[PDB]
Amino acid sequence: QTHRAIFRFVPRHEDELELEVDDPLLAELQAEDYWYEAYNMRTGARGVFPAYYAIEVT
Amino acid sequence: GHMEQTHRAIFRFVPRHEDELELEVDDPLLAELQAEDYWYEAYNMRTGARGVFPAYYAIEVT
């Protein structure tokens, strides 16, 4: 588990991942435009979300 | 008549989607929160562009 969601994110777009506060994530930063590609370890869903909605954990 | 600035961008936002508004840090905004999904409908007072962006990317101004 690499990251954690810090704010609620409700998708508007089909490619986006829904986040609740405190969701644990496996994620990779797409640094060309600062979106994460991620797997939500609470829901099992996949998709993208804007980078400042998550912190790195280690 | 005047409209006061409502919000200020705090993080860089680079659109992936046609309806989105590009933000640079400290950009001045006129914006209205959409409560069903916590996106703003906004006008960027620096760039003159319009579109949507996610709520955590801006603060309220006074």
Curated annotation (Swiss-Prot), chain B:
Quaternary structure and interacting proteins, as annotated: Forms homo- or heterooligomeric complexes. Binds specific components of the JNK signaling pathway namely, MAPK8/JNK1, MAPK9/JNK2, MAPK10/JNK3, MAP2K7/MKK7, MAP3K11/MLK3 and DLK1. Also binds the proline-rich domain-containing splice variant of apolipoprotein E receptor 2 (ApoER2). Interacts, via the PID domain, with ARHGEF28. Binds the cytoplasmic tails of LRP1 and LRP2 (Megalin). Binds the TPR motif-containing C-terminal of KNS2, then the pre-assembled MAPK8IP1 scaffolding complexes are transported as a cargo of kinesin, to the required subcellular location.
**Where in or outside the cell?**
Cytoplasm; Cytoplasm, Perinuclear region; Nucleus; Endoplasmic reticulum membrane
Name listed for the protein in its UniProt record: C-Jun-amino-terminal kinase-interacting protein 1
Tissue distribution is:
Highly expressed in brain. Expressed in neurons, localizing to neurite tips in differentiating cells. Also expressed in the pancreas, testis and prostate. Low levels in heart, ovary and small intestine. Decreased levels in pancreatic beta cells sensitize cells to IL-1-beta-induced apoptosis.
- What family does this chain come from, according to its entry? Belongs to the JIP scaffold family.
What is the associated disease?
Answer: Type 2 diabetes mellitus: A multifactorial disorder of glucose homeostasis caused by a lack of sensitivity to insulin. Affected individuals usually have an obese body habitus and manifestations of a metabolic syndrome characterized by diabetes, insulin resistance, hypertension and hypertriglyceridemia. The disease results in long-term complications that affect the eyes, kidneys, nerves, and blood vessels.
Domain of life, per lineage: Eukaryota
Which region is the signal sequence? none
Kindly provide the PTM information from the record. Answer: Phosphorylated by MAPK8, MAPK9 and MAPK10. Phosphorylated by isoform 1 and isoform 2 of VRK2. Hyperphosphorylated during mitosis following activation of stress-activated and MAP kinases. Ubiquitinated. Two preliminary events are required to prime for ubiquitination; phosphorylation and an increased in intracellular calcium concentration. Then, the calcium influx initiates ubiquitination and degradation by the ubiquitin-proteasome pathway.
As a miscellaneous remark, the entry gives: A chemically synthesized cell-permeable peptide of the minimal inhibitory domain decreases brain lesions in both transient and permanent ischemia. The level of protection is still high when administered 6 or 12 hours after ischemia.
Q: Which organism is it from?
A: Homo sapiens
Q: Which residues of the full protein are shown?
A: 490 to 548 of 711
> Can you give the residue ranges of the SH3 domain?
4-62
Tell me the domain comment.
The destruction boxes (D-box) may act as recognition signals for degradation via the ubiquitin-proteasome pathway. A minimal inhibitory domain prevents pancreatic beta cell apoptosis in vitro, and prevents activation of c-jun by MAPK8, MAPK9 and MAPK10.
